[PDB]
Design a binder for this molecule. Structure first.
Ligand code: BCL
Ligand code: BCL
Ligand code: BCL
Ligand code: BCL
Ligand code: BPH
Ligand code: BPH
Ligand code: U10
Ligand code: SPO
Ligand code: LDA
Ligand code: FE2
Lengths: 281, 301, 246
């Protein structure tokens, strides 16, 4: 089944691998070489997860958890039921995430659009990879990575954060948070404007981009503009994730203590670190 | 290499745009501000004009009053020493009255009074601004979508410093005005309520907070990927679908099996964002009024 | 327990929200069809929404969605397999037939007006007060195609007034006529504007505009669809990254 305006788009081409071998769709989904590579990685990864569930002894989605190799194993392999599965599953996730992006690119080529989407996605893959691959490696142990489990990974965040006191003090973390909040704010604002313009008060003609600009200027004295707002939304969310990866990649590699202490560099600045009074005086 | 439309290649500038008039009282609209070639690389280069009626004046006034009330306290906490003011800027905090004072306004200025005063200004500033987001839309005959979405944010804000503190019986529950202190408060709030990760509404709020970053990255990337067809002209693409809207829709359909419409995607967007503080506001409001420990609560659910 | 009653109610709400949301995003492209253009058996769990009517600005009309598919022109593609799910090959030249990456929609053949009723897009020549305020001014530069051949020169910038944004580049061809090139499909360089999407020999075929001072939505689409189509259909004519660095 196609959208009423789709047929003209389902033409051959755009694939990056295997010419027209996998160039086709299954229902609404496009397959392509990476379509199968994804299904392969996804299934094998899901299979190994269900397997770990078996070895763990439970089918409860709430309880199933796959931990990485204990710190003891450092950066080598480990018994499938004690670090190895997580290791193969991680590869299966990476392969599946990368294959998902590469699949997107082919789709981009077939439709003739820009590659922004898979490019943006890559940041997510890079964030995940930062937690699961890069930080662990720099720290010398897959043990430092998080566990695949609905709650265990939340426990992982809690315990990892509290390892440095209140993680709120990680400056990279703050910037990241600002980006996430600013983003949601931008998203609400953006979605609201387009809608307020497309859906004026009952009975009126659709508002125009001029009304959009006018509304925001009247309100805030500025309008970033349609192109800008999307550029912003993309920049905001991609920056959030980028600073998330950053806030983590440095935690445990170049900064080990309580983050709150980091801020002492500013308080201790030679020209006021000793003035009595205030909070730190 | 190809150009990914992240920054404009060439900037163009026409005369200052005074915008639409509709039912707007032009007498309350300032003149155009300056043009930023800086901003211009990313979005419009034009600053202003801004509309400032009475509500707007009341809002900026209260807002500044709130800000300054915190500022004077900060300066007081600094001993009026600019050097100390700057080094401990993030450490200063205007805290609310202790539990002893309950929901009374008897707290001595230096011990909850200023905070109460600052909060009153902030209260007025925010609500008057909300009315403004409504009235500015009304003057242009637009939907109140912004006003409504703003409420969702206001909801979390009101719950944190007004609604919940009242329900709890004291201003001491409210959030302090300080960079770090308000962070300490957040952490503390989790600690005192049995870890907020076990709060279902905190988990949701995060799903939507991640989802907003996920969706805007998607939407923004999409639009930019079809801007070569004028996809940014969304209102236009809504009224008269173009290959831009079709290719955007098909990319997602072929990728994840379903898609949106030029107008519908913004509905997904507004809810994704609005749900953030909506669920979150509920999460917080329930904390300490109905649930003292989310871990505990979680055990029976 | 309130918390419980709350989280319970929320999921109902969320499911309904998603439902509502999903149905709203079916105001276009639905009902689904089989590759042969007939109603597809499966239409999905969500039913088409109640129609809504958009009162268009400046009596340009109304848009009622969902409604009957506006696309009825001929699609120059032929099935490549009896079973559903396969590509449909171009029967002629996809670039010219307007299919594949070069598809275009039969949008309204009028230029878009701004809030004040003036063509939203104008050539700078005709945009009072508009000028290049930053960045290399593209005007006057020679336009090079992926074949690394000159296909013309930039004679003007078409500006989106409301957004004070450059939308197209007006490129004069060898024959003296001009074509609009999407701004986001050209790379303004120091000594020339490069168009990777098209080769010199394809510029002539870029759909032309009726009036030299305005462009309509239908024309825009036709111009954009065509220029994008080049990425795929001009591949043989396009030069390598190494050839371009010479
Ligand atoms: C429930 C969430 C907590 C909270 C948790 C955090 C955390 C965690 C962080 C901040 C941070 C910030 N908070 Mg806070 N913050 C809360 C409520 C508030 C309120 C309010 C209700 O009025 C205000 C004005 C602020 C303001 C701020 C900014 C100074 C800073 C950047 C936010 C941002 O991206 O804004 C975007 C909007 C515009 C730019 C406009 N917070 C509540 C109490 N806040 C960040 C920081 O750097 O803090 C030092 C940070 O990391
Ligand atoms: C007590 C706990 C600590 C704390 C400890 C930590 C730790 C520890 C970490 C964070 C991290 C983050 N913290 Mg913190 N944090 C605290 C309090 C806060 C507060 C707040 C209100 O107080 C806020 C707003 C934040 C905000 C954040 C975010 C910036 C960041 C997580 C987003 C991210 O990186 O995504 C990145 C994106 C991804 C991980 C997604 C990858 C998705 C993959 C590519 C695709 C999945 C496909 C899927 C499997 C298929 C599904 C099937 C389909 C649905 C069909 N923290 C407290 C103080 N925080 C994290 C960070 O920076 O991470 C880098 C982090 O590690
Ligand atoms: C750096 C940030 C931390 C982190 C911090 C948190 C915190 C803090 C919270 C979550 C929560 C969630 N996390 Mg997490 N999370 C991390 C990395 C991941 C990864 C991954 C491959 O990297 C995945 C798939 C998830 C997935 C999830 C969801 C199950 C859950 C809420 C959905 C959401 O926020 O969607 C954002 C995305 C969308 C809305 C799009 C659709 C995504 C769907 C909903 C996710 C399906 C996940 C799926 C069940 C995993 C199984 C896949 C199968 C094996 C194939 N997290 C890293 C380690 N996560 C929330 C929760 O309730 O946890 C219990 C929560 O509070
Ligand atoms: C140790 C700390 C606890 C914790 C304690 C809390 C608490 C406590 C809260 C959150 C809340 C949130 N947490 Mg938490 N949180 C933790 C860990 C996390 C992690 C993680 C580890 O990854 C993540 C991703 C999150 C994520 C989140 C967000 C979903 C949510 C905040 C939305 C928001 O910022 O609205 C920000 C928006 C507002 C506050 C709206 C109000 C803004 C007003 C209207 C405007 C004021 C303007 C003002 C006058 C200044 C003007 C500025 C000038 C114009 C420039 N938390 C840890 C476990 N978290 C909040 C929530 O709702 O939870 C359910 C909350 O209250
Ligand atoms: C980079 C910035 C933001 C962003 C962008 C982004 N995400 C994206 C994209 C983009 C641009 C896509 O194009 C792509 C998409 O197609 O969405 C519809 C996607 C996507 N983002 C997703 C999720 C997601 N994104 C997130 C975040 C973000 N995405 C950022 C905020 C989050 C979180 C935690 O915040 C999540 C959960 C997917 C829905 C989708 C990518 C789908 C995909 O890759 O499918 C291939 C694989 C499978 C179907 C199965 C893999 C199964 C196993 C191999 C592994 C699983 C094991 C383990 C790793 C999971 C552990 C889970 C526990 C922690 C609960
Ligand atoms: C639905 C939830 C999200 C959201 C939405 C949202 N915020 C909004 C709106 C909307 C829909 C507005 O319409 C309104 C706005 O006018 O945008 C510019 C606003 C707004 N969100 C703001 C801040 C804000 N929103 C936040 C969060 C969020 N807003 C959520 C992510 C945050 C945080 C902590 O994340 C902050 C700090 C204000 C910039 C603005 C409302 C302005 C206001 O109330 O001003 C009152 C005071 C003055 C006029 C003077 C202040 C003086 C200064 C020197 C200090
Ligand atoms: C203007 O343009 C645009 C469109 O079209 C007009 C679009 O549709 C979209 C796409 C966005 C939506 C349809 C909104 C809803 C999407 C989300 C809230 C994001 C979260 C995603 C999911 C829950 C689905 C994930 C599904 C996957 C990965 C497929 C795997 C499944 C199989 C069965 C195989 C965007 C961004 C857009 O900008
Ligand atoms: C004057 O000094 C110079 C330098 C100019 C300026 C210096 C100013 C400075 C340094 C200002 C710093 C301000 C800061 C750091 C503010 C930080 C705020 C933060 C970090 C968080 C805010 C959280 C606040 C919330 C959640 C507030 C909620 C408030 C309400 C819900 C309203 C409550 C109202 C009450 C109790 C009053 C009751 C009144 C009635 C009857 C309605
Ligand atoms: C606690 C406040 C909750 C506010 C929820 C508002 C969501 C905004 C929804 C936008 C759609 C508006 N509407 C009525 C015009 O359709
Ligand atoms: Fe948009």
């Amino acid at each position: 089944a196609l959208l009423s305006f789709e047929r003209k788009y389902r033409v051959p081409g755009g694939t990056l691998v295997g010419g027209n071998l996998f160039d086709f769709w299954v229902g609404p989904f496009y397959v392509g070489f990476f379509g199968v590579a994804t299904f392969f990685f996804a299934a094998l990864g899901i299979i190994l997860i269900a397997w770990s569930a078996v070895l763990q002894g439970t089918w409860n989605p709430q309880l199933i958890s796959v931990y990485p190799p204990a710190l003891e194993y450092g950066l080598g392999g480990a018994p499938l039921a004690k670090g190895g599965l997580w290791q193969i599953i991680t590869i299966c996730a990476t392969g599946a995430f990368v294959s998902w992006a590469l699949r997107e690119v082919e789709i981009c080529r077939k439709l003739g659009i820009g590659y922004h989407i898979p490019f943006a996605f890559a940041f997510a893959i890079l964030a995940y990879l930062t937690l699961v691959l890069f930080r662990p490696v720099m720290m010398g142990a897959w043990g430092y990575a998080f566990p695949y489990g609905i709650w265990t990974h939340l426990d992982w965040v809690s315990n990892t954060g509290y390892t440095y006191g209140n993680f709120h003090y990680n400056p990279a973390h703050m910037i990241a948070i600002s980006f996430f909040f600013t983003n949601a704010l931008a998203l609400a604002l953006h979605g609201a404007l387009v809608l307020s313009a497309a859906n004026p008060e009952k009975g009126k003609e659709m508002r125009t981009p001029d009304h959009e600009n006018t509304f925001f200027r009247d309100l805030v004295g500025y309008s970033i503009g349609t192109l800008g707002i999307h550029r912003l939304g993309l920049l905001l969310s991609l920056s959030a994730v980028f600073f998330s990866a950053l806030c983590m990649i440095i935690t445990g590699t170049i900064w080990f203590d309580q983050w709150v202490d980091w801020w002492q560099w500013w308080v201790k600045l030679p020209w006021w670190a000793n003035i009595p009074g205030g909070i730190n005086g | 290499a190809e150009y990914q439309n992240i920054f404009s290649q060439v900037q163009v500038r026409g005369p200052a745009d005074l915008g639409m008039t509709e039912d707007v009282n032009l007498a309350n609209r300032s003149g155009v501000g300056p043009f930023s070639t800086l901003l211009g690389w990313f979005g419009n280069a034009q600053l202003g004009p801004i509309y400032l009626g009475s509500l707007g004046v009341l809002s900026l006034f209260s807002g500044l009053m709130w800000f300054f009330t915190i500022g004077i306290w900060f300066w007081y906490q600094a001993g009026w020493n600019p050097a100390v003011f700057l080094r401990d800027l993030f450490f200063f905090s205007l805290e609310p009255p202790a539990p002893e004072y309950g929901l009374s306004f008897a707290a001595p200025l230096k011990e909850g009074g200023l905070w109460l005063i600052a909060s009153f200004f902030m209260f007025v500033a925010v609500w008057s601004w909300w009315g403004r987001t409504y009235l500015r839309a009304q003057a242009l005959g637009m939907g109140k979508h912004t006003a409504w979405a703003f409420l969702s944010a206001i909801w979390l804000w009101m719950v944190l410093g007004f609604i919940r503190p009242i329900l709890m019986g004291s201003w001491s529950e409210a959030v302090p005005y300080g960079i770090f202190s308000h962070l300490d408060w957040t952490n503390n709030f989790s600690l005192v309520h049995g870890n907020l990760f076990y709060n279902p509404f905190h988990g949701l709020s995060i799903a939507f907070l991640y989802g907003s970053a996920l969706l805007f990255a998607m939407h923004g990337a999409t639009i930019l990927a079809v801007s070569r067809f004028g996809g940014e002209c969304e209102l236009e693409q809504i009224a008269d679908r173009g290959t831009a809207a079709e290719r955007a829709a098909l990319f997602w359909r072929w990728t994840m099996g379903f898609n949106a419409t030029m107008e519908g995607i913004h509905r997904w967007a507004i809810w994704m964002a609005v749900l953030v503080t909506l669920t979150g506001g509920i999460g917080i409001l329930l904390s300490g009024t109905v649930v003292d420990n989310w871990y505990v609560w979680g055990q029976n659910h | 327990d309130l918390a419980s009653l709350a989280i319970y109610s929320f999921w109902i709400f969320l499911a309904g929200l998603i439902y509502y949301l999903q149905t709203e995003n079916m105001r276009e492209g639905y009902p689904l069809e089989n590759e042969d253009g007939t109603p597809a058996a499966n239409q999905g769990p969500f039913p088409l929404p109640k129609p809504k009517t958009f009162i268009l600005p400046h009596g340009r009309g109304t848009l009622t969605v969902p409604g009957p598919e506006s696309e009825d022109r001929p699609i120059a593609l032929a099935r490549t397999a009896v079973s559903e799910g396969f590509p449909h090959a171009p029967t002629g030249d996809p670039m010219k037939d307007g299919v594949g990456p070069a598809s275009w929609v039969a949008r309204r053949d009028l230029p878009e007006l701004d809030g004040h009723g003036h063509n939203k897009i104008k050539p700078m020549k005709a945009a009072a007060g508009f000028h290049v305020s930053a960045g290399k001014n593209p005007i006057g530069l020679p336009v090079r195609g992926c074949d690394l051949e000159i296909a013309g020169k930039v004679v003007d910038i078409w500006v989106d007034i409301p957004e004070q944004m450059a939308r197209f580049l007006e490129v004069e061809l060898k024959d003296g006529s001009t074509r609009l090139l999407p701004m986001q499909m050209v790379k303004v360089q120091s000594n020339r504007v490069h168009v990777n999407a098209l080769s010199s020999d394809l510029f002539a075929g870029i759909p032309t505009i009726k009036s030299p001072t305005e462009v309509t939505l239908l024309e825009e689409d036709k111009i954009c669809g065509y220029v994008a189509g080049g990425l795929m259909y001009a591949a043989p004519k396009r030069k390598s990254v190494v050839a371009a660095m010479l």
